[PDB]
Structures are given as C-alpha cells and as structure tokens.
Amino acid sequence: MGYHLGATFPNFTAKASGIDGDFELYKYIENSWAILFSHPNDFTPVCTTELAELGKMHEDFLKLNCKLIGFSCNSKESHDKWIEDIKYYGKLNKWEIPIVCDESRELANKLKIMDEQEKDITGLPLTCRCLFFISPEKKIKATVLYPATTGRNAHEILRVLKSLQLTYTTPVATPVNWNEGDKCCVIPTLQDDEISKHFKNEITKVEMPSKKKYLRFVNL
Template identity: 50%
Template sequence: MGFNLGDEFPNFSAKTTAGDIKFHDWIGKDGWAILFSHPADFTPVCTTELGMVNKMVEKFKALNVKLIALSCDDVDSHSKWTEDILAFTKDSKFDFPIIADPKRDLAVQFGMLDPVEKDSKGLPLTCRAVFIVGPDYKLKLSMLYPATAGRNFDEIFRVVESLQLTAYKKVATPANWKSGDDCMVIPSVKKEELATLFPAGVETKTLPSGKEYLRFTPDPSKPAKK
C-alpha cells in the first residue's frame, strides 16, 4: 500500500522489544516519531545502523522525537540481536524499541517490502524505509533505501530540524542547509509581514526575472546575532 505525504499514519498495534504499543499513544501528545525498517536482524549493515541510532537517541529526544525500528523478525530475535549491537558499539543500554512483524502485516501495509531481498524461505524482506511522523500523526517525510546502502542518520536528524522549522517558523531550508545557516522565507508570506515575522531581517536577492522569491533570513530558531 504505502502512504503519501500528508496522510495520517495508521494507529497500528504491535509487539516490540519494549512491550505492546499503540502507535499514536506511544508517540504521545505533540510528539514527533521516526519509524524505520531494516531487512533482518543479525546482519552487518543493519547492526551498524541501529548502533548509530542508539547513540543518537538523546539528540533526537532533544527535538521531541521518538525512534522505533521494524523488521520481519520476532521479538526474541530482536532482543538477542541487541546484545550484539551493544557489543559492537560498546554501549551499555539499548534505548529504543524494535517492532516485530514476522507475518509481514505491517510491512505490506506500509509498502516496506523489498522485491529483491529475500529470506531463506524466499519471502521478501523489509527494505530500509524511513517514515517521519509529526505531532498531528501525519506523514512528513518518507525515504526508501536498498538493503546494500546504510542510511546517514545525521542527514535524517538534519531533515527533522528542517521539518520543525517549517512547522513552527514559516521558513524553508535551502540546498545543503544545516542548523544555524540562513533559511528561506516561504512564498506564502507577504512582503508586509516580513518585518513582524522576521525581526532579524530578510535579504531579497535581485534576479533577472524581477521576481522577489529568493528571500533569506537568519535561522529563526537560533539567538539573534548582536
């Protein structure tokens, strides 16, 4: 099936390494969530990915973001695998849940199955999907990676920062933006609103077309420079 941006993400029930959950209740009020799948437990790239996410839990928590993983393995497999992940990363605690989906019900519902990667029984595995869900429980971002390409979770963190700026501050972020860089005023903001909404100032680029659509302003989430 899969989902489009702006669709409400299902309030599914699932068994996880942290017990049974109802997704919206697990996110909580006004929270953000990242649901990401991996092909299989006890595999090399997946071990590095979940190890990296485990190290970033506190960073994401500072943005009010919860993390939860998923694959077609069962809870017992997930729990045993986390011991390997912790041994690899030399961490003492595994700090986010992993959803068990052995019947592939959620993988089918979410459009996560990889037609190329299959298990020993010939059944398709989950691809490396990423879903970011906002406080309104709507899908804000989705990405699909092949099994061979490990994800860059620094990039996923950067995208969350961008999404939250757009949600709260009426700005967009340009190519290669990182937190603290100048942002762009969204086109729907009128010229007469600029001074009120962006007290740090707005620089409008002069273009051959004469159209004033390239409008830059300092990152509004950061303290104003003196």
C-alpha cells in the same frame, strides 16, 4: 491514506523488543514527532551499523521531542538477542529504541516497504530501509525508501527532522544542504508587509534576472 505526503500514519499494535506486552504506536508517539524506520534482517552487517548509530543519537532525537521506532519482519527473540550485538558493536550500555516485530508481514504489506531482493532463511520477503517522519498530528511529513544494499545517512535523518520542526512553526523553507544555524528561505507567498510580525532579524534580498522578489534569506 496512500502513505504519501500528508497522509495519516495508521495506528498499529505489535510485539516489540524490550517489552513483554503489546506495543501500540499511538500511545507511544502521543504529542510527539516520530520517525519509524525499518531494516531488512536482524544479524546482518549494514543493519547493525545503522542501529548502533541511531542508538548513539537517541538522546539528540528525544531532546527534540521525537521518538524513534525500529521495525523488521523478525521475532521478538531475534530482536533481543541481536540488541546485544548492536550494543557491543556500538559501545552502547543501554538500548532504548523499541523495535517492532512484523513476522506475518501484514504491516510491511500495508506500508508498502518490502525490499526488491531481500529474503530470510525461510524464503519469506523482508522490508527495505524505510523512513517515515511523523508529526504530533500523525501526518507523514517526509518519506525515504532505501534498498537493503544501501545504508542510510544518520546525519541526514536528524537534519530532516530539524528542518521539519522549524518549518512547522515559522514561515520559512530550508534551502539545499541546509544545516541548523544556516540562513533559510522566506516562503515565496509571504508578503513584505507580513515580514516584521514573523522575523526579528533582517531579510537579505538577492536580485534575479527575472526581477521577481522570491530570493529572500533570513538568519533566525
């Protein structure tokens, strides 16, 4: 739709790193959660540190049935050469993340992920540091747009994914600064009668000055 929350992430076909043929998004992400992330330019320092980090974390995502898909306005030849730098910097011996090529900027213009300042050697614009968290139903669950100046928090990416997956199946919402294993919130619309069906463990109620009963925590 508008690539705002709840919209369907569109399918696309593109060239990608490590594969000789066409990369098709929907075939790659079928029955999986996916995180599509862009970066401004290959062979730049922040981009190298981010991709080296995500390459280390790859198994943490895959075990949660989540695919990682890279993306920049660079060529396939640039991606493959740059990968050797990412592997060297990150002490990686096996690169697995497909990095999509968008040399024409058609996808970057459609997704609305262009950077405010960043341009390549040819004077053409480049993408910012975007994130799209995509459900197995192709729905955009969460988005982030960081500028080229500001490297992302890779721990935050895994933390958001764990919250999205938990809240997808259970009637809970994760509080501020929540980490896996911490108590979460019972959704405010869940009535006291409905609690036992969904929760094995005891709910903790915190009394508020307003006397409303919404402040409820649960340890799953």
